[PDB]
Write a protein that binds this ligand. Sequence first.
Ligand SMILES: Nc1nc2c(ncn2[C@@H]2O[C@H](COP(=O)(O)OP(=O)(O)OP(=O)(O)O)[C@@H](O)[C@H]2O)c(=O)[nH]1
Ligand SMILES: Nc1nc2c(ncn2[C@@H]2O[C@H](COP(=O)(O)OP(=O)(O)OP(=O)(O)O)[C@@H](O)[C@H]2O)c(=O)[nH]1
Ligand SMILES: Nc1nc2c(ncn2[C@@H]2O[C@H](COP(=O)(O)OP(=O)(O)O)[C@@H](O)[C@H]2O)c(=O)[nH]1
Ligand SMILES: Nc1nc2c(ncn2[C@@H]2O[C@H](COP(=O)(O)OP(=O)(O)O)[C@@H](O)[C@H]2O)c(=O)[nH]1
Ligand SMILES: [Mg+2]
Ligand SMILES: [Mg+2]
Lengths: 430, 430, 49, 430, 430
Amino acid sequence: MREIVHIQGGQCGNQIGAKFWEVISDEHGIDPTGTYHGDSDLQLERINVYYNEATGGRYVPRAILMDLEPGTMDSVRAGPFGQLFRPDNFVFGQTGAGNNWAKGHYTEGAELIDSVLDVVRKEAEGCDCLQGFQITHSLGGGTGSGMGTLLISKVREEYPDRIMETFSVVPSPKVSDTVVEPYNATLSVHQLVENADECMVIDNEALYDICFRTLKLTTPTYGDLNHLVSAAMSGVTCCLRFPGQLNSDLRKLAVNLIPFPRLHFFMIGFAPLTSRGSQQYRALTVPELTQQMFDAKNMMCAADPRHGRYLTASALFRGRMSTKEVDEQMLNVQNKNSSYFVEWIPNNIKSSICDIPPKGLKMAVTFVGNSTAIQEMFKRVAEQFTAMFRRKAFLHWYTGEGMDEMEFTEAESNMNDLVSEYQQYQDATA
Amino acid sequence: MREIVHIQGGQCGNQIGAKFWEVISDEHGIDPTGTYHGDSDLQLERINVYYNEATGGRYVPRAILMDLEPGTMDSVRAGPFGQLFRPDNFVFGQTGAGNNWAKGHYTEGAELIDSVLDVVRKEAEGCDCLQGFQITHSLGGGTGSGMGTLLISKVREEYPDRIMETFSVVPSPKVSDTVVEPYNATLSVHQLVENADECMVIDNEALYDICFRTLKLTTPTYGDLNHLVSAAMSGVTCCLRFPGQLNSDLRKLAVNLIPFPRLHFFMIGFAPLTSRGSQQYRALTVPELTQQMFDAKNMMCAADPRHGRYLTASALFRGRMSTKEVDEQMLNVQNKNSSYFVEWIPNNIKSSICDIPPKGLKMAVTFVGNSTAIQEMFKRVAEQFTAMFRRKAFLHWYTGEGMDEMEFTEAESNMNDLVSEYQQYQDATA
Amino acid sequence: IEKQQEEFKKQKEKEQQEAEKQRNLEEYQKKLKEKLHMHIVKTDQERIE
Amino acid sequence: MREVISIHVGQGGIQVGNACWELFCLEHGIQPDGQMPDAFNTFFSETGAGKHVPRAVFLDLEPTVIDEVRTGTYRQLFHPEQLISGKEDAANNFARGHYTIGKEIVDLCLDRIRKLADNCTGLQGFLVFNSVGGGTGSGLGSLLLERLSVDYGKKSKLGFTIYPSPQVSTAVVEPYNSILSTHSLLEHTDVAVMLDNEAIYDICRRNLDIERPTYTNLNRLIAQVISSLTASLRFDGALNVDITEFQTNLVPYPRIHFMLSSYAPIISAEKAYHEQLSVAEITNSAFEPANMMAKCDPRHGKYMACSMMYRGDVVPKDVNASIATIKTKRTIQFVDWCPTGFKVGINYQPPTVVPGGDLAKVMRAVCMISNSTAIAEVFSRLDHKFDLMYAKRAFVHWYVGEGMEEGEFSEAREDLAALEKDYEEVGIET
Amino acid sequence: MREVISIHVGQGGIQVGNACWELFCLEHGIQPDGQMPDAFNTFFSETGAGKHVPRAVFLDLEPTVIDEVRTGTYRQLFHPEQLISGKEDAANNFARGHYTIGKEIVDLCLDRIRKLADNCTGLQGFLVFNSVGGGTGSGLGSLLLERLSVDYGKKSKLGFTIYPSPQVSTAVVEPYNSILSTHSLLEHTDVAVMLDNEAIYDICRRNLDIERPTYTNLNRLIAQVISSLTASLRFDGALNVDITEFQTNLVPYPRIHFMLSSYAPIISAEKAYHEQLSVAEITNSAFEPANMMAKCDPRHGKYMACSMMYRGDVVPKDVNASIATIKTKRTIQFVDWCPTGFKVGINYQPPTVVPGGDLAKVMRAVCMISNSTAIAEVFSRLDHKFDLMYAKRAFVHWYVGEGMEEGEFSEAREDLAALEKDYEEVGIET
Ligand SMILES: Nc1nc2c(ncn2[C@@H]2O[C@H](COP(=O)(O)OP(=O)(O)OP(=O)(O)O)[C@@H](O)[C@H]2O)c(=O)[nH]1
Ligand SMILES: Nc1nc2c(ncn2[C@@H]2O[C@H](COP(=O)(O)OP(=O)(O)OP(=O)(O)O)[C@@H](O)[C@H]2O)c(=O)[nH]1
Ligand SMILES: Nc1nc2c(ncn2[C@@H]2O[C@H](COP(=O)(O)OP(=O)(O)O)[C@@H](O)[C@H]2O)c(=O)[nH]1
Ligand SMILES: Nc1nc2c(ncn2[C@@H]2O[C@H](COP(=O)(O)OP(=O)(O)O)[C@@H](O)[C@H]2O)c(=O)[nH]1
Ligand SMILES: [Mg+2]
Ligand SMILES: [Mg+2]
């Protein structure tokens, strides 16, 4: 019951999913052949959340994979746990977008999306009670940031009451791999605010910083960043698949973390994270988890959370632990940092406890906090956008496929209005 | 409860700690792998004073090691009992100070100290009831005498009510290994008087004299001086870790040995000390301990204690012995030497008894006396400082990093004022 | 001896001033909060109307 | 021929219902399978041959807790189709569980209530349990109370609500639905008992000496209080009290029926038997402000009426001799228009112990239900918390979009203001 | 139906309380576990079945001694939660234990005192033990006495304080807090008994022939004196004396209640039986100046009143025949306005012997409590010691910085001057 379907688009989203599904399968004891080989009874009670049942007793994820080029899905199939995905759900084009948002949203993405919407509708109509959808995509690419966001609007138009999740990677100015990143980032943020019920920003720069400083491993690769993102993704829905002292589905988090409908851009972090050589030194206790949870360097975004004030915060503890300690520590982390918490909403931290810890760990915490410090990312994105747009650089590529500069002006104005009205509440006082 | 954390800086402080922690571990029966293998029940009751607990049952010291160069900590790790130290507590720079006080206190030491202060704050906030801090460093080096003393002020600013210990090695003019010793000694003494609650001076010359005359061993090395300093260090806090007839924590000594807040520079000594060939001749009795305890050559400083009068004295007896004998001997050592005790404060000797002797010894004594004879060390240090400063020798190295001669003049004036007002009470009469 | 009396006289004067300052600040804050609440009530009436 | 029906709604309600239903089964000798290997009739019903069926119904929209109940050791006890479960959770939204999804479930619950009531012949009244700071709990409790008040009329209903702590909180939006639910049950429930978690945490910490409590320890104490309240209906006693004999003794006026409870003694077996546990000392401990089961100070207000139950071998003369002592004390003062304010009940059955629990076995116990003027502080602080966020209309869109009108928030505020004015008007002397 | 409560505060107080509580348990036949294998009621209370609980409470801020008590053979005797312990020691600072850390502990002690007093029905009075020359002892004793004097009023309190020796001292700052505590208990305690260590050391050396005594030997003699004083309340005697029958016989004026004690015989089993130990010789030995329990010379002053207790097979006529002989002697002279000054008590129970102790078993013993004019010498010498350091304001900063005012030292000096003038005014003949 109350299950969700997985939809991913683009190369970055496909690579994120290729590790997210591996993590989920390892958590539920599903072999790469789709056969259950788990140890505990609880591993099968709520498997309908992510997995479907077919004849022969094997399980198949309800994931939908889409891209405008076939290479990435032809590569993910040969990887581990690549056989679980149903071949029918693979939809792709023969041309690609070339990191051009217009091509992936107006000319090419519009004709292809009917086929993927057909299978999306097939998956949603069938399921017992829908909880919602979760979306993984990147804002630094053309086909992803175009087709995914248009699909968001199409899904929202047909299921207005369901919940919608988006895990979005925004292009940081530090590690830049594409010159046309500001254009399709700014165009995508315009559409994303209007339809997504929840959005979670993730930055490659913050992932590299975490890998270099906390884990202290010499050579980070995309596999480590994907693993961290996958652990963070799994931590959110853990209590929906396992029993606990205070169950809290996604809708309950939506109620408690979004004060106003347009303020739904969160930054997350996962604890504990320790190096291989120091994993024996540390002792896992609730104070040790909560001190690392609110650490500024532990956030999955380069945004500095002590440059603003938290509107609200959430924590999803895992493992068996006493609730009194959790509540007193949450109170203590809020009394010692009163300057960084907005004062006109008292008791702005939500807590939840799940009795099933991750495989290999005795305690774990997932942190989701809505803070005013996120304005800095939109500020720098808009700064680069307005630095590049004033000369109409690279504009002809977009304008040759039916798009105009008016949609750029409206997007810039709406993004600046969002930036302004997000900080409006930072200076608000009672 | 009432535990303390260990912080050491510089090469000399690191070498002192490398033997202090070995002595403590041998006293508590902790193997170099962190596993308890002791014999007595009392060995574990108060182990929380110096050691933390981690998963797997092993113990880890709450020590913080800092230096401006990585060599010394990369060397102490390979020594015996080097694995106990948590790798996370090691903080170091890549440049070093080059025995220049300005570099280790203004330019390089200021930027690095944030990281070490982070772990210091982590250690202190967590512990059950803080008693205080103890600091080991040398006044003859640049990075040590700069960063340690600035850290003293930073710690004092945040914990004004806790107690602070400093074991400071001052450069003697007899055995000189650095030409710029007077400058960073005089600069450090200026800051040390303002913030340290207790200070204990130790001289290499006195250690060599003791090793050559009392122990009569042919070839002294730094390991023997470190062992003597470590035994003296352990003797002070013994009754805080073991039961006894009259327990006396560090704060009780602070109350009883410091008459005025600026007179907190003590010189110490340890008894008994006997040669290998004469360890069978001697019989350990309270008179034998007390006659060696007040012996002038037994002091850990070259200062001659019969060149002045004791303001107060303290003794920390170890082992099981009768209190009546201790009190009568303390009275006798004060009646036969009335000329060397100040007359306007009667009964100026404090005694304490701890029932647990050192491993291998049946009785031991640690002596801490506040005497007016310490003026001679500051006199000679200031004499060398003013002999070198009048020509502005080596001054450009310090003045090229933002420091000026005014801070030298103020330091000299304050040090001379301390020298004068310390002897002011020597001639005072009732 | 002169220095001893003078030193205690200068220190004694310090401490008293600090205690008094803290008390004044606290009282002021409480009165201001009450006034703000009444002003808020009148504003509430206008929005309701 | 005397019966009572208990209603459990929400996660907290179900988790305290489990706690009370181990205790009742243990106290009446019924095995977890429901089989005995004439006092049971108050809570149970005979099936003709063999097992007993509880007169209880479990409600929740979120299926996890009910599924946990239906697989534990008590799977055979409860009737399979009185554990009504939904599919979609209200997610802390009050408007959801009162207007959207609770309406489609409430009919089945009312049908079950009718089917249980037609079996009883001497129905004393209803009991209901619900944690107030949640969507489904507060909303469904309000709707059920409103339906029952018109279906049955004058039958008595008792509510054991758990209000949020003064500063400790798990959600961020619980003041809104707490205020709305207080509005709903103010004019619909005959008795409401205060049960916030912080006071019980302090009780456990101080008396039970548990430093890491969980929810089960709290629920066991609540279950013991319920058993003490309802013991008089199913055991012989020298001075009996019925449920219907409350509004004539504790409720001076129809609006004022919120009171706070206390229990004594609370002590562990490790140090219980060293002291005699006389009736005087337990009745003194019960009146201690620190032993209130709700975090309110009785020293800040007058008492209106005290109803307090004993059980064990207590003799009435010893009870009178202790009521006199309490009337003597100057720190406890009653209201002017109430000369006598004590209602005393005495029962013979000593409290039963649950194996593996915290409380030890004792021969005397006291449970007090006291109505006092000091309860207005919790209303004032909840009102202050509500006003802060309602000034800016925060989180209101999550409620307006679930069918609730804009003006519904204001009238709850007006009713709380009326209640606070009424509490002030009653407490003034004539 | 007669009871007394003993209060033990500080290290010396707890160490003498242990000494008296072996003796009482041995004298009433109670095993160390508290189980007997109607006279016990004075010191103990019956729990209904089995063990007995002492009417004593142990106080200390420094946890070592209490932890030693809670692990010895007497762990099962004392109630677990009447051994109140702190975390931080006062460290010989009087201002600490009266203004800073003692205030937060005193409330628990007063609650325990109330809980013990409500059990007693015929409470005779309180006993208190505290070594005066310490921070926590003197400060907490002063605060407890000040609270009790107003909570209970006219109930009698007896203080067995241990003043410092004339020349032998363990601390260096004990005159300050000794004078302050004398100030505090001058107007707050009904009886104060002198107990300095030097006199008892001389007694042990001369009579017991022990050349290396420890604190236990001193505490056993003090325990024997306490037992002799309180024997008359729990054993049948030809001439009984109650505690309340003291201020009418030994205290001529409300200010004068400091008196010094003596005991006889004190002799070892190796030479005890060679002599007959007649009543005349023991009552002569008790009046010998060298057998005073405080180092004061009675030949330097007049006597005011002598209260002296016998126990064993003594006959009153032999007592009278010995009082006459003492009145005859020319070296002992009484004050002019007191014709008869002796109060005599006779008890039948001989003193009990502790196994492994120093004293032997005898059939006759005498304990005298004598009030004499010569006690002013200890006040004069303590005053002289105080003035020497207070002239230069030494060690005052350790007290001013703990909340105490500057002028508080002067008024204690004025009260001592008043007491010394009063003692001179009383001793002059009319
Ligand atoms: N005393 C006690 N309180 C609980 C317990 N579980 C939850 N609560 C309280 O209940 C409040 C939230 O309501 P819940 O009962 O957890 O959830 P709910 O009532 O089912 O409402 P939903 O969130 O819509 O499911 C929290 O603030 C907790 O303080 C419990 O086991 N014991
Ligand atoms: N007769 C006797 N005197 C003692 C004993 N122990 C300590 N004293 C005296 O107590 C004085 C100091 O006070 P302590 O009792 O030791 O310490 P305290 O009262 O707990 O005060 P703190 O130092 O703050 O802990 C010393 O001068 C001793 O003479 C003892 O066992 N027997
Ligand atoms: N975490 C992660 N990020 C990736 C990976 N591959 C690419 N990216 C990010 O995705 C961005 C490029 O997106 P792109 O591949 O053009 O998306 P597309 O246009 O939808 O195919 C780069 O800035 C990378 O930082 C990966 O394997 N893991
Ligand atoms: N006791 C002892 N003293 C040492 C040792 N090594 C160096 N010293 C002393 O430290 C002084 C030099 O200090 P330095 O190493 O420059 O301190 P740094 O600048 O902080 O690294 C010399 O005068 C030595 O006497 C050692 O192993 N033991
Ligand atoms: Mg729920
Ligand atoms: Mg002590």
